[model samples]
Target: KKKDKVKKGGPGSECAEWAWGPCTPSSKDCGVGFREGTCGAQTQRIRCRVPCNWKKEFG
Candidate 1:
């Protein structure tokens, strides 16, 4: 059950909290990205970042 090259784990068993900041803190250039949200009554900004297909495989 892989999506975006990440083994899609079970819902409620996963953690997708975004610790976003002004600086682009790198995740050690990890393999998989994640999803997060900051939703409310007047604001709903849920993000689901997928794999980068455009990044050239230089191998």
Candidate 2:
């Protein structure tokens, strides 16, 4: 059977502090921000850390 997989862009990267949708404890999800809001400026500029997944390759 195939296992569930999350792709390498958003959730898989270590430095990715936010997810696109609902909050899950496994991954961080900061709320969407408005202009002038404290988190707003960082929304677009943040990036993910290298080596997106725990494993070297998907099994």
Candidate 3:
């Protein structure tokens, strides 16, 4: 519970390197993407490499 000792954002707030997973579809097969990590998960909605045509087939 003392995890608060770790600061989230600041110049002096250092964090050990964390493991991460490959980006995967967030919704509708490939409209957006996200990845998981030891610290948590991440997501970005602007774009993704999956072709819409592919998603159209599997979505």
Candidate 4:
């Protein structure tokens, strides 16, 4: 429980319009990656455009 009312750099500071903090895993072949820790970036990685279905149907 922590709430200072959230108001610093404003808009929760950092990657506004959609920050990232989930979906992580990538190394090629049925891969996945999207969970930056980016606070305003080129913002574009979030992969998984159909590949990891059951590790690409049984690795």
Candidate 5:
């Protein structure tokens, strides 16, 4: 679990607030979220406990 290639201002960004973890390689592996920006800004990468089941929640 490496915090590589972080994309911001998208679905990943929307979930940034929920990311309550460190922004490191090891941290990310242990269910933490990493952050990065494309041009210049703060972005986040989060860990998923389970596969996103949008249908169940949205439908």
Candidate 6:
């Protein structure tokens, strides 16, 4: 059996909830994209996928 020690200042200790913003293209529409949101005093981005149907309907 192995024991794992909990580390401080790691992802496990990250506070604040993230609220997602709208997904928009990093370059072209309806492809690989990025979106941002707020967490605590920080903002972060995550890559998103935009479906062709989405552009046909909303782009």
Q: Is candidate 3 or 5 superior in lDDT? A: 5
Taking all chains together, each candidate's TM-score versus the true structure is 0.21, 0.17, 0.34, 0.19, 0.21, 0.54
Task: Judge candidate 3 at residue 30 and give its lDDT.
Answer: 49
Per-residue lDDT of model 3, residues 1-59, tens digit only: 45422122222211234454444555454445443345335322222354545445663
Q: Write down the TM-score for model 1.
A: 0.21
Highest TM-score: which candidate? 6
Candidate number achieving the greatest lDDT relative to the actual structure: 6
Q: What lDDT score belongs to each candidate, Candidate 1 first?
A: 0.32, 0.30, 0.39, 0.43, 0.40, 0.54
Instruction: Tell me the deviation in Å of residue 57 in model 5.
Output: 46
Order of all candidates by TM-score, from best down to worst? Answer: 6, 3, 5, 1, 4, 2
Lowest-sum lDDT 10-residue window in model 5: 24-33
Error of 6 at 19 (Å): 1.7
Task: Write one digit per residue (lDDT tens) for candidate 5, span 1-59.
Answer: 55544422245444434434534433333233344333234444543343233343764
What does candidate 6's lDDT look like per residue over 1-59, in tens digits? 43321111123223335776766665556576555677687765666677845547663
lDDT of 4 at 55: 55
Better of 4 and 5 by lDDT: 4
- Global lDDT for candidate 3? 0.39
Question: Model 3 residue 25 lDDT?
Answer: 55
